[model samples]
Target chain A: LNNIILNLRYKDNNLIDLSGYGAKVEVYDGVELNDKNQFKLTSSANSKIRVTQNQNIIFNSVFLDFSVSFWIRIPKYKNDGIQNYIHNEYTIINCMKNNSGWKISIRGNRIIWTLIDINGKTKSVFFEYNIREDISEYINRWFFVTITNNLNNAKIYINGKLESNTDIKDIREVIANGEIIFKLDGDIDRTQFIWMKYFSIFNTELSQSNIEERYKIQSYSEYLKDFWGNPLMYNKEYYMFNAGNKNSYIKLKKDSPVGEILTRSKYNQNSKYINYRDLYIGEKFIIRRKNDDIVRKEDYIYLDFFNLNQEWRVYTYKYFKKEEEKLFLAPISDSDEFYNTIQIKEYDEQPTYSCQLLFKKDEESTDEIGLIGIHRFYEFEEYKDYFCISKWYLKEVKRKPYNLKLGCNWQFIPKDEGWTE
Target chain B: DMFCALKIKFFLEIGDEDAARKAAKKCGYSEEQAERII
Candidate 1:
């Protein structure tokens, strides 16, 4: 029952023979692997990949229990006019032989399973699940679908979730006379335009939990981890630009500012604060967290330096309410004038924090780097400014600033002398 | 040898490549041989 009759990954730019059952495949029409390593079926017009029966008796017969699972992505439903029952359906698998094999199809957004009894009597069963709701939300996203039949019952699962189940009686052995066809039948009228990545056929019926576990194994994250073996919050890095001068690019760390630059010049001066306003834009940033690890480049937050609407802002990559990945931007309070200081803080408010920066615009003239250490009460009042300045100086000395190293050269001394008050 | 090969095949058929590879290794076969046989 654990025997696999067919396993196709389409990895070799052709239908690969991973099943070890000598399953011969014949590909027709435009059924080819795309850049994403998925079999892209673009049309219902004669596009298909067929598996011919082999000498192995188990490969041609499914009498007891069986399961089939695959990953597919259908970008959009094609409007090919008002279609009837035959033309309206999108066939996933059609393995009928002498009217005794099973066929799975999608009709009106519902999965339909047609089983032919050993006595040659057709019993068409419809899954109670409707993919219309999921289709509207996911659209072109990839999803997992698995169908299992245990002699007397049949079940359908979508993305590891049990979608529908039904009682199927009078089950019999399925004799394979013709080749098992995928994407379309020989007539080519019931063709389905889908991008399939992997497919497997098992001679044993998989349970609900087993189906879910299989889906998770196949859908693991492909993104590499950071030095700490953590996924990069943002996909890329950040860069700083002063007017038209592209200074340098910097990679961000978990609890560090993205690209902190210090200047002695005024906020408006081209030379002050390096005298010019800085803009940060989306760029590739590389980071190395471990000594033996390679520097990996990922997507980072972008800063629009030139278009300063008199606000110092910070952006971080995070997931939104809809589970969509995006860069969330938060600006400093408008009431504060000290634009020279910025700090990346992890407040107790949200589950995640964005990179925070404090800086002044040309329109405002303030010497005090507005330090709003709201979270930490003691450090906020006294040492906040010095803390930020010291951090900037450290980064400047290490990475080297765009031009002259100004206000960052100040030395830090203990407030309390040897004589105690 | 044939029994060990069938054991590797059974693991692969159940979508457990890790187990198949381990079984092949225990059976005194190289990773390449395990991949080819599976």
Candidate 2:
């Protein structure tokens, strides 16, 4: 909602762009929508979404960069051989061609995003989908489109992830004197006209997650499962699916334990909205190994040893050095050999000892490889002995390649660990 | 268990007990585990 220049959603016969700045909406010849329940003012063949140009109008100008996103569905779209049409352009007060603009169109099954600078010289980028049986498989289908101009670069997203990106050579701002037109140059049969809604324009580019949230919330139910939990319960059982935040996992279940291993998928990327980290803060997890990040057998670690909220002290019976043969994480009792150690947080104000999150891209999935927490332990923190403070992060381990992750990536077996209550 | 504790601490620091609970629930974690995660 913030930094939005325009946000247009179809109401009834007319449409208005939201964002404190409501862009005036006007439809011209033959532009009435067939269905009032869906898209606003459909059949925009020779017509365009027009707005009066004014120096004071924020939507009429673009500084260096901006973004526009919307949902569209057009079945059997007429493909013009060489003409690319989808445009966000400005003209002189008298309606002559002058000044700058950008456009997005389907040149074949490929997408062409073009930028026109002050002199109107055009630079363009072509995007191709990963899979397609035919052009219809890519187009005729309903999907979300997001185009971002990032000063020197441009990117296009389909359903939240980057489909393709390119470079923008010209850096210029544009303000229209007469009118601004979001034009569609291509043709469409009235019966099979284009369906577009949720049009939005941002003063700055939106990040990947922002695109994902928009795409996800379309169903709203999916977003709930993501934020809340998917499986409610059945026959007195609980479940947590793909649990992760801060890039960690946990376990769960009953006599038929059906839960975690905690999980927070990790948060990175500059979404320019809400603290993205806020989503994962309550879902963070811990590392599994006390030694190297490489996998071991103690993945079934426990946390019932001491106070989970504050720094505390504890010890293992004779299970200390003798447990070199048994390093799996287990609880330590009160009557111990000698109160062995204490655990202390590195302190939030300065977790300098904590490392930065790892951001390596994924192999197959376009989604990124999540973040790592700012945490560390000691073979020697102060070496005086820090057990409880560190045990909290003790054993949330994963078994993937060592290079793919940083610090630790582990989970807690939920049911036994009370992760099911 | 041990791992869930670290998660609870992390969420506690960031002030997301509810987020932790729901997230933990998503993973099928019980209350004890959710406590740390939340």
Candidate 3:
């Protein structure tokens, strides 16, 4: 392993004249080191570091063994990509030196770390002799840094000393399928600062002990290597079947005994009129309507058993609204619709409207007959009367079907026998 | 066994509308019956 040859350089590798990319300024790749050893980036006042490489480095998979190091002059508004290292997922690390510091970030992820130095308070993190620190005076001044991953552990080292070792095995597994890329997070024009430096990469994962030694021989080209994972579940597309909330609505059995006696409307609104007192075929009740017996007011208003001798209880309120809406729902005390509800216990297992009680009596019977009514059966236009047993007819004593002529008793006759007449 | 425990809890707490429905789902109750129970 010692025989592996190494070459070091001070020239820009991914350097570019970013002015033509429609950016307001020009930025060059690589960094320039001054006599003071203060490393600085060469970028025009309005320039931005651009990410335009094809097959962009995606750190979505395990790079189990690798070393990444660089010498940087922390800028005023420091921003770096892929800070959250969970499951190889991307997160942005944003920081500022003066109440603002350098940030490590990943694309399409959340914020991971924030380092702000004010009032001379400073914190140093050790990652294998690479001292990661927030030094107030080092803003835009070149400082050495490195990060090493030795499969079992990882650390961030700064300026030649171990500063921070983040137990990030969990994070690595979280963003386990992410990618890597180089792009400055802050706007140089907006912050009036720049970050210039040499970035180094290693093929083999380096431990805390190898950061300084590894940086002496690595190159930026090592990042060009690829690590891809299997395609994500569902191909990042929407499946219509799973598009909305699960279909949690009710479904009536096809052979239910009550199915023939009742029919549902295409509009879900019709379900509201279904009275709990009328849920079963043999259930019945009497509703007193002082006005004309319109369907809305009385036609299906009261229901009863076919035999008329059994006691009927409120079955189930057909339709319930989560929130009250006009034309259907009302407040609790003033609700115009039925309230108590009962579920037909085995409503789904059998045929539509077919209940155990309805079917237990006769399995061979096909026609399930509900109650029949004679009230409101006739529509008399000649007498200027609508349906219902008229008030005058309620007072009549005779039970014979006698036509007393349209001029005399026509207005006093009960038009239909469906009523108690 | 886990399912059996959940079913007992469901029957025990199967009175309220929303809780009953949730308990039904937890007990592997059919969707239709769950809704009706709610």
The number of the candidate with the highest TM-score is 1
Put down candidate 1 lDDT per residue, A386-405, tens digits, no spaces: 11222232333334223222
Off by over 4 Å in 3: A1-46, A50-63, A75-140, A150-152, A172-181, A186-189, A214-421, B1-38
What DockQ would you assign to candidate 3? 0.02
Q: What are the per-residue Cα lDDT tens digits for candidate 2 across A1-421?
A: 4667766655666666656554566756555453322353344455466765334655435455677777655332222311222322211111223656655555334556666666766666665543212112233344677888776778888778798777775655543234556554445334334455566677787888887777766523211111121111112211122222333332221111111233343224332221111122222223221122222221211122212343222222222221111111223433222222212111112101122222222223333222222232222223211111112222322222222232322222213210111
User: Which of the two, 2 or 3, has more TM-score?
Assistant: 2
- What's model 1's lDDT at A161? 79
* Local accuracy of candidate 3 as per-residue lDDT tens digits, A145-255: 665554445566665566666553432222211122234444223322234344444545555566555444332121111001011111111111000111111111132
> What lDDT score is found at residue A283 in candidate 2?
22
RMSD of 3: 32.0
The 10-residue segment with the lowest total lDDT in model 3 chain A: A223-232
Worst 10 residues of 1 chain A by lDDT: A411-420
Tell me the TM-score of each prediction against the true structure. 0.48, 0.40, 0.27
For model 1, the docking class works out as incorrect
The recovered share of true contacts, given per candidate in order, is: 0.00, 0.00, 0.00
lDDT of 2 by residue, B1-38 (tens): 54344333333333446644654665467878555533
DockQ of 1: 0.01
